[PDB]
Amino acid sequence: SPAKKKVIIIGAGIAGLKAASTLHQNGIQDCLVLEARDRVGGRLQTVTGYQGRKYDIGASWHQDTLTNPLFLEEAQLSLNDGRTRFVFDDDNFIYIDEERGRVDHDKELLLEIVDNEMSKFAELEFHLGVSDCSFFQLVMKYLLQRRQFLTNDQIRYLPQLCRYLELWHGLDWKLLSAKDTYFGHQGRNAFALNYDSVVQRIAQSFPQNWLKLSCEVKSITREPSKNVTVNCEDGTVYNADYVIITVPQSVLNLSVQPEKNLRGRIEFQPPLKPVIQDAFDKIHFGALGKVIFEFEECCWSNESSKIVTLANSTNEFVEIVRNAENLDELDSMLERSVTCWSQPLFFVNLSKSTGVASFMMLMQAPLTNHIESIREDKERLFSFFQPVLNKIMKCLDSEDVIDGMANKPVLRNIIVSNWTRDPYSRGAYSACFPGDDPVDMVVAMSNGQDSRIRFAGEHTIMDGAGCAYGAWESGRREATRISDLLKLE
Amino acid sequence: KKVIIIGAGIAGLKAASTLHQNGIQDCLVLEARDRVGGRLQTVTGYQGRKYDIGASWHQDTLTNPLFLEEAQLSLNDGRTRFVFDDDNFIYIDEERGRVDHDKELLLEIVDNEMSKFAELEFDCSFFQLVMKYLLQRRQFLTNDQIRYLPQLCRYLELWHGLDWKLLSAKDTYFGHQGRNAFALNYDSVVQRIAQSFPQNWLKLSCEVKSITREPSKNVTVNCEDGTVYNADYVIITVPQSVLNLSVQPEKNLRGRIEFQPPLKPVIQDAFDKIHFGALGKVIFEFEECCWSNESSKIVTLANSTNEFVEIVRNAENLDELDSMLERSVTCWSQPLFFVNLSKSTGVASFMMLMQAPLTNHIESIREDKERLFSFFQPVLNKIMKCLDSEDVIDGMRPIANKPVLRNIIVSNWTRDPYSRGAYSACFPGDDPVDMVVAMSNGQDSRIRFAGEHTIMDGAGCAYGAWESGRREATRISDLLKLE
Ligand SMILES: Cc1cc2nc3c(=O)[nH]c(=O)nc-3n(C[C@H](O)[C@H](O)[C@H](O)COP(=O)(O)OP(=O)(O)OC[C@H]3O[C@@H](n4cnc5c(N)ncnc54)[C@H](O)[C@@H]3O)c2cc1C
Numbered sequence: 006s007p008a009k010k011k012v013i014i015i016g017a018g019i020a021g022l023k024a025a026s027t028l029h030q031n032g033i034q035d036c037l038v039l040e041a042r043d044r045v046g047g048r049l050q051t052v053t054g055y056q057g058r059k060y061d062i063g064a065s066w067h068q069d070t071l072t073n074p075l076f077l078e079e080a081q082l083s084l085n086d087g088r089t090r091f092v093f094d095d096d097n098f099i100y101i102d103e104e105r106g107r108v109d110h111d112k113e114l115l116l117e118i119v120d121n122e123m124s125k126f127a128e129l130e131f132h133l134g135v136s137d138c139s140f141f142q143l144v145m146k147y148l149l150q151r152r153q154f155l156t157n158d159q160i161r162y163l164p165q166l167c168r169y170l171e172l173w174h175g176l177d178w179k180l181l182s183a184k185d186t187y188f189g190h191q192g193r194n195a196f197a198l199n200y201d202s203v204v205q206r207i208a209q210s211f212p213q214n215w216l217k218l219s220c221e222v223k224s225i226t227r228e229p230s231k232n233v234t235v236n237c238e239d240g241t242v243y244n245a246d247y248v249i250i251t252v253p254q255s256v257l258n259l260s261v262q263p264e265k266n267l268r269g270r271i272e273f274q275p276p277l278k279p280v281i282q283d284a285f286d287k288i289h290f291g292a293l294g295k296v297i298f299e300f301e302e303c304c305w306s307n308e309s310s311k312i313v314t315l316a317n318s319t320n321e322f323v324e325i326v327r328n329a330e331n332l333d334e335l336d337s338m339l340e341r342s343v344t345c346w347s348q349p350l351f352f353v354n355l356s357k358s359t360g361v362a363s364f365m366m367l368m369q370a371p372l373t374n375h376i377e378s379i380r381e382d383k384e385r386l387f388s389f390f391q392p393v394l395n396k397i398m399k400c401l402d403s404e405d406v407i408d409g410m411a412n413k414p415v416l417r418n419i420i421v422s423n424w425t426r427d428p429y430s431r432g433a434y435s436a437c438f439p440g441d442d443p444v445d446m447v448v449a450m451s452n453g454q455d456s457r458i459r460f461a462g463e464h465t466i467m468d469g470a471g472c473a474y475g476a477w478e479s480g481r482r483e484a485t486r487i488s489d490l491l492k493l494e
Numbered sequence: 495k496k497v498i499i500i501g502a503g504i505a506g507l508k509a510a511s512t513l514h515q516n517g518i519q520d521c522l523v524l525e526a527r528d529r530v531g532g533r534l535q536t537v538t539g540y541q542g543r544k545y546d547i548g549a550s551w552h553q554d555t556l557t558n559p560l561f562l563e564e565a566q567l568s569l570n571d572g573r574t575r576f577v578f579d580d581d582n583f584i585y586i587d588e589e590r591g592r593v594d595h596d597k598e599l600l601l602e603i604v605d606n607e608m609s610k611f612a613e614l615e616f617d618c619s620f621f622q623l624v625m626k627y628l629l630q631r632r633q634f635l636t637n638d639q640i641r642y643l644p645q646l647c648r649y650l651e652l653w654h655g656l657d658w659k660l661l662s663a664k665d666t667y668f669g670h671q672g673r674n675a676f677a678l679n680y681d682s683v684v685q686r687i688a689q690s691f692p693q694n695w696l697k698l699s700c701e702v703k704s705i706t707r708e709p710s711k712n713v714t715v716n717c718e719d720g721t722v723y724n725a726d727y728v729i730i731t732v733p734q735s736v737l738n739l740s741v742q743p744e745k746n747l748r749g750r751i752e753f754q755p756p757l758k759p760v761i762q763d764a765f766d767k768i769h770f771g772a773l774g775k776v777i778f779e780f781e782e783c784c785w786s787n788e789s790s791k792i793v794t795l796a797n798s799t800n801e802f803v804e805i806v807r808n809a810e811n812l813d814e815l816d817s818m819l820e821r822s823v824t825c826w827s828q829p830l831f832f833v834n835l836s837k838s839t840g841v842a843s844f845m846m847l848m849q850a851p852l853t854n855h856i857e858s859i860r861e862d863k864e865r866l867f868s869f870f871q872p873v874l875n876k877i878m879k880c881l882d883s884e885d886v887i888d889g890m891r892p893i894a895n896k897p898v899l900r901n902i903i904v905s906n907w908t909r910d911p912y913s914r915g916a917y918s919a920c921f922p923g924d925d926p927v928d929m930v931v932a933m934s935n936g937q938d939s940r941i942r943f944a945g946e947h948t949i950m951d952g953a954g955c956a957y958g959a960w961e962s963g964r965r966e967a968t969r970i971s972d973l974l975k976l977e
């Protein structure tokens with residue numbers, strides 16, 4: 006009364022866990038990890054479904070495997086025990102239109118080839134001063150400038166195909182920033198089997214009594230006497246030499262608004278600095294969501310573990326491109342109810358990569374918010390997705406899906422993410438709207454509220470921004486710093 | 495004479511064309527060969543079919559100023575000058591067969607990782623880099639991926655015209671600015687530019703053997719036949735490899751120019767840090783197309799061993815890796831790049847690309863058709879097999895439904911003294927920006943350089959030469975107007 010801790014970490018996602026791991030590795034005693042949920046892991050969450058099949062409903066992949074320090078760490082472990090922690094599941098993308106059917110690897114459409122050109126065209130637009138536009142506006146520039154060297158079908162389907170990027174950002178192409186759109190993936194992705202393995206291993210690397218679940222932090226206060234007071238929901242009070250705040254950027258955002266009775270919101274005294282407050286105007290939050298379709302057994306072609314359905318497109322669009330006089334003129338005549346074919350869906354066929362009869366599919370805002378809201382009405386979900394499911398089975402030498410919630414594929418269960426509605430995540434991760442500069446947030450975050458009040462988390466770091474390993478590295482960064490500072494006695 | 499231009503390749507021609515367009519009169523283009531075009535040459539074969547035996551593609555078509563200029567004419571008259579023949583590559587191994595877009599091998603995907611890896615690494619050969627990659631990422635590669643990936647990525651040999659052991663890893667990968675456009679044909683482009691300036695400017699079969707800055711501030715050029723010439727400005731566009739003869743004493747070397755004063759050291763030194771690739775071509779003309787037109791792009795992989803995979807897995811490190819490895823030539827000894835012209839052009843021929851050291855060996859026997867056929871017969875049969883046809887029959891002399899080879903054409907760029915190779919390329923330890931900067935600033939105010947080797951954007955490429963020519967002329971033209 007009040008209990009004195011060396012370091013207090015808020016949030017037990019991967020950033021928080023790694024911070025705690027690092028502090029203990031560094032010999033620091035008497036620390037505490039305060040987590041509002043009843044589980045560790047945060048936006049790493051593995052869930053179980055039909056037949057006890059397991060699925061990562063948060064992050065699934067180790068990305069940038071050539072440099073990903075967290076991935077490398079897993080890999081070194083597997084190299085030593087022979088255990089399977091991940092599988093490389095990069096594959097040839099199957100691309101489907103409702104009408105045309107398969108559209109990938111087409112010797113007429115050559116979509117993947119013009120995609121690479123489209124992308125290289127993008128890279129040549131973004132070398133200082135040049136303003137931001139939506140990724141949509143970017144694709145339209147390309148199509149206009151290159152219409153002479155594109156078939157009508159290329160003009161039609163290419164724009165739909167390049168929108169798989171929506172499922173990497175969790176954002177619609179009209180909402181997505183062209184600048185931050187095309188990013189260099191540093192090597193193949195590795196599918197985690199599963200991520201809870203990663204969370205558990207790190208969780209178990211520090212004192213088990215450091216961990217306090219079901220503990221929502223409500224306020225943090227810098228004492229003029231060079232200490233930090235942390236107040237919890239249940240009236241528990243703590244005093245720390247250092248605090249590392251890892252709550253999602255969206256939750257951290259609640260702080261700069263007046264009304265305090267919001268789940269997750271931390272009251273700051275003195276308030277969060279102007280640089281931190283203003284940085285919120287220049288970075289945003291994506292709604293990447295997941296829907297898991299579990300089937301009795303695989304009754305489809307295992308040609309590929311990567312399937313993308315394209316939203317519908319018109320031949321009328323192609324003529325508008327042919328007939329526009331220039332950009333401004335094209336933007337006008339375009340503006341002159343939502344279904345499954347209204348946007349690109351990314352489907353991961355787990356039967357091929359993991360041997361489980363289930364499709365893990367990804368969706369983006371605004372669809373995600375909508376779909377996560379009705380995540381209780383399973384039959385409405387079935388009807389919504391049924392046309393793209395039947396389409397998929399058809400293009401994979403199978404028949405319509407039968408609602409089982411022979412050789413006909415029978416759906417046994419549907420699982421949906423909840424990241425938008427969960428007060429402790431409030432969306433998927435850091436995303437850029439047109440005009441955004443994520444560098445502002447990273448600089449303000451990595452610089453800290455002050456010497457004692459720090460931040461970590463996916464939204465606080467350049468390399469691996471938005472990714473598990475970025476989060477993981479941010480936590481190590483704050484902790485090694487604090488560890489060094491403390492070691493000076 | 496206002497300007498004297500050496501070389502009537504695309505650099506020289508555009509330089510001459512640009513001079514006329516800007517109102518400059520009384521110039522002169524000296525060319526050692528009996529034709530214009532330089533390394534742009536279109537030849538005729540069986541049935542009259544035409545082929546670009548030098549350059550055939552407009553590269554970097556998102557930027558490429560010459561390409562845009564061509565497309566602008568085809569938008570004006572609707573006349574086909576090119577075709578986008580970019581396609582999905584079929585990859586063929588002698589033993590396994592087709593190997594592209596395979597669901598278990600995923601070679602193209604690991605190739606993309608390999609390139610990403612090369613990008614991150616930045617002083618060695620492309621071969622060492624690939625080995626370095628496999629050794630580092632072997633935990634994440636299947637056995638067959640280790641076997642076949644290093645063969646697949648050697649497609650890059652047919653870009654630099656250089657074997658992977660001879661090729662610098664630094665200058666190996668590069669980004670194309672978009673799709674390629676197969677030109678139909680380059681001669682159309684050659685003739686268009688050649689005619690855009692007065693034909694009395696042209697002098698053929700005039701080999702230039704000395705260039706001389708008068709201390710009187712003028713340029714004295716003299717030809718092989720003893721003809722003397724006088725000009726204010728001189729634009730030299732001879733290929734790098736020929737220009738490189740100038741740093742040697744011996745005079746009677748075909749093509750070699752005597753400089754007075756000698757080339758500036760920074761030009762002489764720059765030859766240490768860049769060299770020359772040897773891309774060659776072979777054309778295989780068939781009576782009719784009796785094969786699949788699935789792709790216009792086909793690559794055959796040099797042979798690989800499972801013995802090789804075993805070695806990677808067992809190598810404790812890089813030193814040990816070189817040890818195990820070292821520890822005659824055929825058509826399977828190296829990758830080869832075949833273009834199926836039937837799909838893109840309508841012509842029943844394969845245009846095949848080859849690299850040093852194979853190139854000079856095949857060119858040196860270009861006259862011996864039987865030996866050529868026998869040398870290529872195995873890959874050709876393989877190709878037809880993977881393309882739903884039968885073995886090729888030799889119909890090159892006078893005689894069912896099998897493919898009949900009627901003629902074979904081979905390039906000769908390595909034995910031709912006025913090309914002496916294909917285009918500039920990097921050996922390990924080279925740096926092309928030495929040469930490009932030196933050429934850009936010239937020998938003095940009066941002695942200029944143009945050519946594919948004289949410019950950063952489009953180095954080695956036709957549009958590079960074309961823009962280099964535009965630059966020296968557009969500079970010279972500006973100076974003359976000022977009086
Ligand atoms: C759907 C989805 C898919 C993704 N896919 C990938 C992927 O494939 N690969 C990849 O690398 N990354 C992926 N990510 C991103 C990755 O999940 C995140 O970058 C990372 O998990 C975030 O870690 P963090 O510790 O920064 O945040 P979190 O783990 O979200 O935050 C840590 C903790 O803060 C807690 N908290 C919030 N408020 C309070 C409070 N008031 N008091 C106490 N605790 C609080 C939260 O409960 C949370 O547990 C994905 C994310 C989502 C949402």
Ligand SMILES: Cc1cc2nc3c(=O)[nH]c(=O)nc-3n(C[C@H](O)[C@H](O)[C@H](O)COP(=O)(O)OP(=O)(O)OC[C@H]3O[C@@H](n4cnc5c(N)ncnc54)[C@H](O)[C@@H]3O)c2cc1C
Binds near residue numbers: 907956
């Ligand atoms: C097989 C092959 C394939 C190629 N493929 C492509 C391709 O697909 N796309 C592409 O862009 N590029 C390609 N290239 C390269 C391209 O051909 C060159 O970049 C370009 O043609 C060179 O232009 P240039 O005018 O600088 O040189 P050149 O045109 O070679 O030289 C100009 C003239 O200099 C003359 N000359 C030399 N010495 C003397 C002398 N002593 N006196 C008078 N004249 C002299 C030569 O006769 C020549 O006519 C290819 C080259 C080869 C060999």
